[model samples]
Target chain A: AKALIVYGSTTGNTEYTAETIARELADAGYEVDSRDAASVEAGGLFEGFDLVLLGCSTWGDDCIELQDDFIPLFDSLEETGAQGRKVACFGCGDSSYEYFCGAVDAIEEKLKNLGAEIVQDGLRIDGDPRAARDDIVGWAHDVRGAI
Target chain B: AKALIVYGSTTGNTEYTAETIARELADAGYEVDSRDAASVEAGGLFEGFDLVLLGCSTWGDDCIELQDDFIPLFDSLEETGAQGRKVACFGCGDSSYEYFCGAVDAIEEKLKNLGAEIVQDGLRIDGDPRAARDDIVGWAHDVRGAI
Candidate 1:
């Protein structure tokens, strides 16, 4: 099976989380590709992959921007092959904000509306991702099991 | 002319800003009504007012919550009689976040979509609102002039 992990992060927290998940998935005997949202296009982003992991932080303005580098892709997300696609979402956020890891919720809702099948609940790391490596690894393991 | 000022503040900064604007509007011989977003409802919020001034701090998370107390009203803003109504927005925000004063932009867009006439640009005070009292008062004066 092939899985793609994409993430948007300001302080590299979500990126780190993505990397950890990619490694975890890779160790599970699956081919995994990890990418930054800034380096990808919305069109056909999910093509050729059995599973797609979309990661983004929840700190943006109205319309709920994912991140600076991820916004353009998010704006044109409808073009992505989300229809009937297996997808999972993860993000980093501070619990101090009322909408902790709100980006995951936004992405999940959009993906759901776009007909994507969510196989697992999102992994939202509060404060620092490195501090939650166990949770990240555990979530990635569970996600792989879901597929 | 009669006016209404509604605000949502966490640390009383935007509340103070709202009070300053209410006082400024009152000084202009306007029968200004000041209320907190939490204490009010979206229903008939703009009734009997020549102008409505919306003051909410740019905060919260995904879906771009205006502020804790303001969310309920903001969610039901269409019921507030915004159509064809003269309105303005102001808020307390920090530029540290990429989407600084984003709640103001969100409210402005929603109000616009609801057909409210925005009379002036929003007043976004970065950092301490007390430090930007001059800007706040100046913006309120211009907003009052718009009516």
Candidate 2:
């Protein structure tokens, strides 16, 4: 089985989380491809992967904003070959905000409509992710198990 | 004051709600311009309106899909000149979905980042708008008061 991860992060928070997940998947003996959201296109995005994970950071004090580099990708998601694909979502956001980690839910919702099966609820990290490494590892382990 | 109402509806449910609010606003002495989402361009859309009302229907069993026609407008929202404009949202959806009236929240969140002031909590009508006439009218009344 193979896994693909693509992330968008303005401050590297979500990127760090993506790398952590990638390492965990690789350690589990799954072939993995990790790319920044800016480097990927929507068309045929998941052709060769068994599972795809989308990640990005959220912003705005009273609103939800997907990380800047991810907006174009998000808008073009309908063109992605997501039908019948297995997927999960992850993101970082400040807990104090009204919609904490909103982009995670947003991405997951879109994936659901694109005929993607959400293999897990989603991973939403608050504050710095280094302290949440344990949580990340646990979720990664579960995601692999679900697949 | 002038108000602009743009709605996307597959079954004309949201369009019915949009017209309900348009009439309520008009009765409140606000001149209103109402149009289908398909008929409008996002760029400079809100220029002359004192308040903008964005309305659309939601779909999918467990996910939120903004009505098909509204998506192009949604993707180009940054170009809509919403900065410092007053805005409100309305929509109809089934509560059976996890995100009921999900499109309303989605639009409100985007408008917020574009610097639009939300004058009232969005009106989320469950199922039929005809049965929710009072709720719709009351929200339009309060929305006008806020502006």
Candidate 3:
């Protein structure tokens, strides 16, 4: 199986999480392609992947803002061929914020609207994601099983 | 009627909106007290007001993050004497973000859960709220009527 992991991280938290998920998927015998949001174009970005994982950290106070690097991709997600594709979202955020892990919610909602098959509830990491390594690994395993 | 406006703003957008709402409410013959989220205590903060207006901006790429100054108040909203009180929420945000005006949604949901009466749907400004002055004033007028 082929998997894609794309992430935007303001403080490296989401990036680390994406990398960890990628490693877990690879260990489970899936070929994984992990890319940074900064380098990935939104158009046809997910064409060949069997599963796509999106990761981004949150920003802004009164809105659910995607990380700077992820905004463009988020805006043009319709062209990513997500329809009928297996998709999942994850992100790290502070629970103290009003919309805890809102980016994950936003992405999941969008993916669902685009006709993507959501394999699981998004993983929302509060505070330091490094401290939530077990959760990340477990979530990756779940996604692996779903695919 | 007496009204209180408490807001937390980064980059001054929510603060400006709060001031505008305060002005409009005062012009409508309502006694208005506007406070920054940083200065207000959550405990019984809404005790004497006939209406409470919560203004916060959203942040976070993956989550719904309230403005930094408003987070503490958001955390203790249950202690603010909100139950049975007339309440409204408003905020400024970018429409380009996934959760447009998500802070307003979060606050509104919380106020509803706490038994606060929602006087109106939240005012979510997509861009420069100054351009939406009429909308803000109109919303304030509606809140005035509800009070």
Candidate 4:
């Protein structure tokens, strides 16, 4: 199955997480392409992907920067009422902050607005994303299974 | 002087802060234009402005999605050096988060990077910003004096 992992990282934490997930997914026999959120062209970028995973580092307590493209893309998809797409989200942040993983919340909001089916609960990782790797890999497996 | 109070709000909290600050600033005789961060244009922003007060709620611990537009604008403004410009930040959040006012911190960082002068200590209004009105007003007065 084809899956995509789009991530935004400010200090390589989220990027490292995405890479780990992608490697696990590939090893598990799923085709996955990990990308930077800012690098992905929102315009028709998801046309052929069977599954999409959103990732970013939490910023300012509640938002995602690399995933800003989601707003316009989600709105466009909603206007078209696209459905049945599988989606998931993960974010890295300092738990000491008010919104432990606000970027994940923002990505989840966009996915919901876009009518994507959530395969599992979104993941929020504090400074040590390594600890959350098991859950993220599980999520990738879940999405792959769904697709 | 004409001014704009721009903020990114989630859960209606930060919006309330912006509104209260605008009202108090208006009472003090400044023409205030307040809008959500997404509603503002990126180009030519911060021009023809004597005082610009930016507000945003922290998303995770260190990012602001509420002011998606403003974040990028400030990012760009940083390169140009917003010298001689007067800017201040205010935010509303729960102290529960480690970075209660991460958005304010991010904004302050950008402003300083852009060469903008900080008129006062940014006020982080926890939970209910109404209680922070006095401080916000005081800061507004300081901003007026600075410019």
Top DockQ hit: 3
TM-scores, all models, native as reference:
0.55, 0.56, 0.58, 0.48
Per-candidate Cα lDDT values, in order, are 0.83, 0.85, 0.87, 0.68
- Top model by TM-score, which number? 3
State the local distance difference test value for candidate 3: 0.87
Report the lDDT of model 3 for residue B109: 65
lDDT of 2 by residue, A10-69 (tens): 999999999999999999998999989998888888888998989989876433567878
True contacts kept of each: 0.14, 0.00, 0.52, 0.45
DockQ of each: 0.08, 0.05, 0.25, 0.18
Q: Per-residue lDDT of B1-147 in model 4, one digit per residue for the tens?
A: 878787777677778878878887888898898978877765666777778888877654423443454565544554433577778888776765433565676567557645888787677787677777787777667767767
Q: On a 0 to 1 TM-score scale, where does candidate 3 land against the true structure? A: 0.58
Q: Say which candidate scores most in lDDT.
A: 3
lDDT (tens digit, per residue) of candidate 3 on B60-105: 6555677889888987898999989999999999867666677787
Give the C-alpha lDDT of model 4: 0.68
lDDT of 1 by residue, A79-145 (tens): 8999999899999987554445766766775677579999898898998999999999999988888
TM-score of 4: 0.48
Query: lDDT tens digits, residues B3-70, model 2?
Result: 99999999999999999999999998999999999999999999999999999888754335678788
lDDT of 4 by residue, A5-118 (tens): 877777777788889888877898778888886666666666667777777776543353333433344334343223667777887877564445655655564466467788
